[PDB]
Write a protein that binds this ligand. Structure first.
Ligand SMILES: *Cc1c(COP(=O)(O)O)cnc(C)c1O
Ligand SMILES: *Cc1c(COP(=O)(O)O)cnc(C)c1O
Lengths: 454, 454
């Protein structure tokens, strides 16, 4: 690869996702990632980086899976594409659907296919509203979400998410979406009794239901653990109370499993860790370990019952809904996870090991809190031990400085506000977990003098 | 394949796209498509079908491309995924971006990546509104589209499209979207002077611009040829007049090229046939001939100038934006089109031949009009020669009957209202075009007694 030429062509012709394009121009083009293997990625200048983010929270089986390349090749020779529009389907999405249903359990019996996690929440959005029309309760239209939730980058996904700066671009949210407090103990409930803070966060949802009018509410939606919001792990009992809330008012419960699904929290799906039974789930990312674009909505049997008994078109779906090659890769991806026990390994070994490894950072002068569940975790940067006080009293200054030193030191982790987050491939070894934590500590040590000087 | 078991699993776990699920159950599950080669698909019961729809308006280079499977395999081994979020990129999407820009020409210099045509129009929606905020004209927010337009199946895509029945599901359109008359001469301007009808259809947009307030309008969006709306080919001079209209009021022009792009109308993009210069275009489907999911928005240089000079995050993008494997297949797909001259062949050979072949149906007692451009076409079914009168005076009864006879006779075509439409792979031969037309005539002959009996 002519790296300099790729960088020139990058600026001349490519608009990267969720980027400041002035910043991209000022660095001479995107940093070029050329190769990858295991848990390591390699850039155009030969730098090896431990990918603590598994691509984009998604490469769960790790890089270098010739088995997945082969599954793609074989399906593309036999039948690279056909639609599911013309009362037709193809073998891969049907077999994948049965496999996903087995992993979903509960009353989640069917799947509707898309390509991205964002589209999945568009499908959630339209199917839920159509479901309530079929049920003869057309007033149930309003979705209740949370501030700092992330539910994608479509107009609907942005609206369902609670990122205020993202809302602004496109003049969102669209109508019929309400947002309430997130259960972020460290930031918003520091020093509160966990049980009391949890009750506050659930009560906020009930207050909105009553404000909107329960007969007007269609569903509550939330990530089991908030991902893009900064690995926000809810207090114990939160999710059971939210489930009980939804049943109290007869509204649907929707869990966005796009990050938490497929082994991330030590379960096939995040909601299974919490023992709740959502009516719909959105899934993507780890579904195929990012090897090909595919997404799905898991749909409860009683919603399918309305579609099947009332009939009528559900006028919703995408050209690449059920893409046979993408489905074939996702099926083989799940089989690898099964064969290698990656879900249970995360629950029983790498997860606990990451927790203990991150806990060794607790004594650092910059660290206010570490938290993790399975192979997702977060390190809080504070200017004062024993508080949640942030440098310059302006969240988002310290984070990027520590992040950039991590990347400099050979570790890809993200800074969300002043939180260092990690989400490595499920195949990460204990030694590599120790390497990850060691680089963070090294970077925190280097960050300490610059942060004190702000 | 155990076809019987696949059908059982289909009903138990799969929800097909844009389907009536009661109807799918009543036929014992989806019809199983197992393999394809050239322009032919094969079902679970061994039926070989001439695919007159190229998958879903998309398999432009035809089935059986080992070269495209190989490109996917090779990229997945080297680097199956990395994100464009972290100021990062990978070689394939950058090289693809330069190639797409070369085919777009004009001031369309950059591409923003997504997976589906629907997402691309979400990108159009948010980028257009963000552009106008960067420009210091924040009142420019409203999109003007047309009835019977189709722009995808996300909330925004449904809202931008003009399918009233689709709007209902999800309680759409969202705010800031207006719809005006489509330029459908046969249905809505039968017996009108074409120039006068064209002027009528252009004036409707200006009337809407003036009603909304020109300072409040962000853009007009439209398919060069309306695909899902029934292959609606606009009258001569329509598109130059629409472009002049947009320039008159300083609003952006957006062309949805998801179907019309990549050779379909005899040009790399539909708008190039009409000599207009859109500010943004949406593309998908033929971009990769459906071999892998990928989409893009082509962006004019002056839009990029706002992003690059004002800076700030454009908080928009998807996990699979710039997917390296999908991009590599799309790049090789374009190279196949170049090598085999598919754009020019469509313009100079197969396009004209299809027109000549379809014109032979003009003498059929059921045919009211045939029209085509490149390798997209439509046959109108009427109950009275020389009129646009429809059977039972209820558009959509005759269509499905003829369609089902076509499929029984070995040709996949779709019925949109009482229009039989076709969109075959660009590699279709003249002999196969004659087979396509012959089956349509055979099916019309069989349909005639049943239609007369309604
Ligand atoms: C990644 C993310 C999405 C968006 O998924 P895309 O594939 O990028 O469209 C939606 N929900 C959650 C929880 C996510 O983390
Ligand atoms: C196909 C279609 C879309 C939607 O594309 P998907 O990939 O199915 O989401 C958008 N615009 C036009 C003109 C289309 O024909």
């Amino acid at each position: 690869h002519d790296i300099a030429e790729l960088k020139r062509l990058d600026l001349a012709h490519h608009l990267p996702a969720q980027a400041d394009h002035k910043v991209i121009a000022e660095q001479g083009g995107s940093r070029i990632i050329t190769r990858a293997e295991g848990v390591y990625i390699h850039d155009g200048e030969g730098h090896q980086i431990l990918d603590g983010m598994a691509g984009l929270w998604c490469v769960n089986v790790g890089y270098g899976r010739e088995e997945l390349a082969k599954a793609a090749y074989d399906q593309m020779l036999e039948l690279p594409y056909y639609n599911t529009f013309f009362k037709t389907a193809t073998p891969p999405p049907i077999e994948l659907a049965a496999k996903i249903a087995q992993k979903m359990g509960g009353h989640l019996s069917h799947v509707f296919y898309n390509s991205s996690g964002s589209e999945a929440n568009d499908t959630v959005f339209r199917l839920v509203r159509h479901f309530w029309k079929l049920k003869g309760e057309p007033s149930r239209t309003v979705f209740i979400s949370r501030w700092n939730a992330y539910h994608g980058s479509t107009v609907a996904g942005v609206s369902l998410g609670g990122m205020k700066h993202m809302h602004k671009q496109g003049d969102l949210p669209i109508a019929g979406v309400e947002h309430v407090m997130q259960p972020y103990q460290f930031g918003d409930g520091f020093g509160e009794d966990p049980a009391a803070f949890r009750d506050r966060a659930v009560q906020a949802i009930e207050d909105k239901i009553l404000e909107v009018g329960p007969e007007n509410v269609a569903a509550f939606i939330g990530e089991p653990v908030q991902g893009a919001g900064g690995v926000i792990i809810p207090p114990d009992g939160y999710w059971p109370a939210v489930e009980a809330l939804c049943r109290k008012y007869g509204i649907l419960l929707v869990c966005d499993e796009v990050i938490c699904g497929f082994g991330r929290l030590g379960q096939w799906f995040g909601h299974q860790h919490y023992g709740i039974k959502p009516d719909l789930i959105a899934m993507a990312k780890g579904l195929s370990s990012g090897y090909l674009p595919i997404s799905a909505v898991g749909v409860a049997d009683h919603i399918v019952a309305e579609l099947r008994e009332k009939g009528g078109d559900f006028i919703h779906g995408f050209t690449y809904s059920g893409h046979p090659t993408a489905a074939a890769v996702a099926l083989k991806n799940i089989e690898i996870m099964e064969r290698e026990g990656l879900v249970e390994r995360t629950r029983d070994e790498t997860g606990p090991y990451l927790a203990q490894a991150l806990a060794s950072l607790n004594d650092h002068p910059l660290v206010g809190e570490v938290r993790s569940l399975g192979l997702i975790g977060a390190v809080e940067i504070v200017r004062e031990k024993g508080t949640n006080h942030r440098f310059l009293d302006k969240e988002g200054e310290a984070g990027p400085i520590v992040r950039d030193l991590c990347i400099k030191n050979g570790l890809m982790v993200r800074a969300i506000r002043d939180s260092i987050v990690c989400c490595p491939p499920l195949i990460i070894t204990k030694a590599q977990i120790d390497e990850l934590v060691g680089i963070i500590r090294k970077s925190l040590d280097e960050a300490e003098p610059v942060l004190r000087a702000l």
